[PDB]
Structure formats: C-alpha cells, structure tokens
Amino acid sequence: PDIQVTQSPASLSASLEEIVTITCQASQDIGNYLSWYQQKLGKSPQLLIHSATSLADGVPSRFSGSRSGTQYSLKINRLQVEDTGIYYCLQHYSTPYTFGAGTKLELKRADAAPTVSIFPPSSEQLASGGASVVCLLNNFYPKDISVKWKIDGSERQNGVLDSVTDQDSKDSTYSMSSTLTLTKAEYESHNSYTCEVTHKTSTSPVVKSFNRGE
Amino acid sequence: SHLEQLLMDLQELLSRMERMLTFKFYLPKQATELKDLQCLEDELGPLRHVLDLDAENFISNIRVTVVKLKGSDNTFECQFDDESATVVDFLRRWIAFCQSIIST
Amino acid sequence: EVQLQESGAELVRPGTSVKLSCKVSGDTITAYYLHFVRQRPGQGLEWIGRIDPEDDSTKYAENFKNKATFTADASSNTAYLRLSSLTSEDTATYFCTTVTFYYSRELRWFAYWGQGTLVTVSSAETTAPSVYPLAPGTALKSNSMVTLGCLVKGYFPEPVTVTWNSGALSSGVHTFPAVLQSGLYTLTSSVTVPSSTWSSQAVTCNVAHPASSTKVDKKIVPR
C-alpha cells in the first residue's frame, strides 16, 4: 500500500515579513519520517527540515516544521526576498518514498516598470539568411505582461518565441525575452519593426521600434 | 500488559542482537513518562535496517504497542541528545526505561 | 563534507537505454544508501529508487520496476542507474542523493544532493548553436546604462551555459529559458552595464554546448 502525500498549496504569493505555512497530508500514520526540501532555479534541492520538526545544519532559523498527527507543516517565520522558489515534502517512512508535488512560492513586490530594449538582426545572422528581431523587458513586476510585435503597423503572431525568467532572488522582479524570427527576405520586405509592451505600470502600451536601414 | 510486552520485545531485541555497530542511534536526555516513548518510535527506521538476519513484523508490532502506550492526546516533540549510541546501548537504555517506568 | 556528481549521455534515442553515474567524493560510498530522483522539465521531484553499495540490495518505485536497474562499484565510489525502454517521458534532470545512519540525525535524510544532469530522449541529432550579438542600434550616449546580449540559436539538445566576461560580470545578467521550435532550441542572454564600461573594456559572452563540444566567445561591439 504505497504511501500517498498531498501538498498544499500548489502555489502562493506572499509579501515580505509574512508568515507562510505549507502543508503536507500523509495517507497513513507516518510519524516523524517526513522532511522538507527547497529548490531554486531547477538546481540541487536542499534539506530544510528533517524528521518533521528539526532544523537542518545551515538553514535560516526562520524555517520551522510542525506536525499534528498526519498533518505536517513547513512554516516560514517572516518571509525574505531570497525565499522565492519551490518547497517539497518527502515521506521517508517506508519504501517507496514519496515526494509531495511541491509548492511554488513567489514574493509580492511593489510595481516595477520594465526596461525595454529592441535589437535589429545582426549582420552576422543576416549573412546566414536569417533575421531575428529581439525585444528584452527587464526587471518588471508584476509578472503579468503582454507583448505584441507590429510590422509596419500590423500585428505579427507567427515566428514569435517568448520566455520569462524565474523570480529574481534579490529584487523579486521578472524579465522577459521576445524574439521575432523571419527570413532575411521577409525581413527586408518590411520597414518598421515595433515591440509593444502592455503592463500595468503604463496607461498606454510602451513602444520600442526601429526602421530597417535606419 | 502493554509495557511488559514492550519490555520483553526490547529484551528480545537486545538478547538476539549481541558492521551493525556503526549505525548511530540517538536518545532523549530524559525519559521518565510514557509519552517519552515517542523518542523510541522515532528511531525505528535505523533499528529496522540493522535488523538483518521478515523482521518487519517485529518492528511493526513494536510500533503499534508504542502508539498504544505513548498517548493519543498530543504530539510530543522528542528532544534528542547529540551523543550517539550503538544499537546495543540504545536497546539497553529503552529496556532500562521500561523497567524504570513500570515500577512506579 | 561530501559531494555527489551525476553524469551520463545527454542525448539518447527512444527504445534504447541510458546509464547514469553518481560519483561520491569527500567520503566512502559504503556509508550511504544511494537514491535516485528525477525531475521532468516543468515538474516536481520523483523518487526512482535506491541501492546500498554494501549489500547491493535495491528498492524501486512502482513506475520504475521494469525500467530501472541500480548497480554500484565500491572500488570507484560510484553508483549507477540504467534506465531502459526510454520514452520522451524519461526526458528529465536526474539527481542522486543519500541516506545515512552513520552520522548525526540531521545528515540522514537526503542531506546531500548532486548538481543534477539532463537526459533528453529524442530521435533528433545533435546540433550546434549559432551565436549572434545583441547590440543597441541607436547611438551610445554616455553616463547612462546599456543592455547588451547574445542570441544563442538553433541548438539541440539542452543545455547551454552562458557567462559574461568569464564570470566577472555576474550581476545585471539575465539568461532566459530556452524555447523549442522545430526541434531546435533558442535562448537569449543579456547583461546590463554602465555605458562607460562598454567603451572602456570588452564585454563578451562565453557560450558552451557540451553536447556538440562547442565553445563560442562573442565580443559585443557597437553598431
């Protein structure tokens, strides 16, 4: 009878100095054989609390664990900017061991306007017959944002690839990269390229633009 | 009858125990009440691994006895000493605790 | 006190197998149970199983019963995971971690983890990236800040690493997650430096793609 474990919440955003509680529920009496782990940027997990209630060696003292029967709690006593990331529980009572599915914790912040940069295709890429137009939106908050590419005034949806960074561990902002990829011939058939940024920090969309050959 | 069953089960374990002496067990500083048996339950993991030549039934039934004895009202947090003990001294210690807590 | 390091083929074909290594240093391997854990790209940790190098005894998750085989070589301080009948679902980062009762309580439960190593299961062949400069196309007006970048386009599989000035630029760096289109990955990496730092000294991105044995250094120059 494999031991199942439910973790909750799946995700959460909380402010600085906030008390955060993360729960794991075990399908059986597991006693003190559950531990808590932290993972940032998809890198190595780190043990936080072991045996339900004991702080591990080099872990901030704001982390603590409690247990009530089959309910287990990870508590962060007053959240720090660096605490953004993912938290996991693990039953290690008997084989097979089982991880909770994780909690994605993000930090709330005051608003921050993106710094917007647009980049024409490099002459090195055009030589290869390709043309990637790049727009970078850096250090903004909140995470929600929308980007549109306009070519000579009309929106282009095809050839666009978007990517957003995980929350920054030092200033809680996000960054985004939008690349519009065209063939050199296609790129040379138009004149004006615009990256249009919609974000709550501006009433009207922020525009960065260039004219091909300017 | 639960205690004396645990005592004999712990006496059984010590008697048939004495490589596996490298495993490090840990004890509470003070063990004077039934709710302190939580600290024994917490070490059954490693106690199971050393138990090598279906002994699972032995540890499992010790655990149910401990759960019947430690109480149901509260989840007592155990406070362990940092000093480790072999599987032998650990077993002798809890045996002594059982004899200690029976005669009161 | 101890380090774990995973390694293995980065690209493997479907239906074939892969053998992953977990090299432990800092201590003997006999003191540990070696557990393997995998993480799918957007997903959580998933317990695969374990082996005890002393006993060679093995424990397996249900989903990996017919898929995984743990071995160990005590002489080389290394445990191994062979994953068979590989599908695209096996595409993941694989970690090793430990259990021990030879030390303190705080060191028993997955106290040590490897850095983790990525395995891609695909029919596609390895492809080297092209690295293009990202330079401001309007004039550089001093006393401001400036954002520079490198576009790393059309490689396979993941991962690639990007540093700036070989690590000397660490702050103001954003390396974005790769995006897959038509079987090829593309990622951008930016660095923000004072406008006066650009003119006085070199700003260069160092790009590596081990899967194709590619190292590229691209100096970013004004346009």
Swiss-Prot record, chain B:
Disulfide bonds join 39-78. Disruption phenotype: Mutant mice exhibit lethal autoimmunity and are impaired in regulatory T-cell production. After 4 to 5 weeks of birth, they develop a thymic disorder resulting in the disruption of thymocyte maturation. GO terms for cellular component: extracellular space. Produced by immune cells including dendritic cells. In contrast, macrophages do not produce IL2 upon bacterial stimulation. It is found in: Secreted. GO terms for biological process: activated T cell proliferation; adaptive immune response; cell surface receptor signaling pathway via STAT; extrinsic apoptotic signaling pathway in absence of ligand; gene expression; interleukin-2-mediated signaling pathway; leukocyte activation involved in immune response; lymphocyte proliferation. The keyword DNA-binding does not apply. Keywords: Adaptive immunity, Cytokine, Disulfide bond, Glycoprotein, Growth factor, Immunity, Secreted, Signal. Cytokine produced by activated CD4-positive helper T-cells and to a lesser extend activated CD8-positive T-cells and natural killer (NK) cells that plays pivotal roles in the immune response and tolerance. Binds to a receptor complex composed of either the high-affinity trimeric IL-2R (IL2RA/CD25, IL2RB/CD122 and IL2RG/CD132) or the low-affinity dimeric IL-2R (IL2RB and IL2RG). Interaction with the receptor leads to oligomerization and conformation changes in the IL-2R subunits resulting in downstream signaling starting with phosphorylation of JAK1 and JAK3. Belongs to the IL-2 family. This is Interleukin-2. The lineage of its organism: Eukaryota, Metazoa, Chordata, Craniata, Vertebrata. The chain holds residues 47 to 166 of 169 of the full protein.
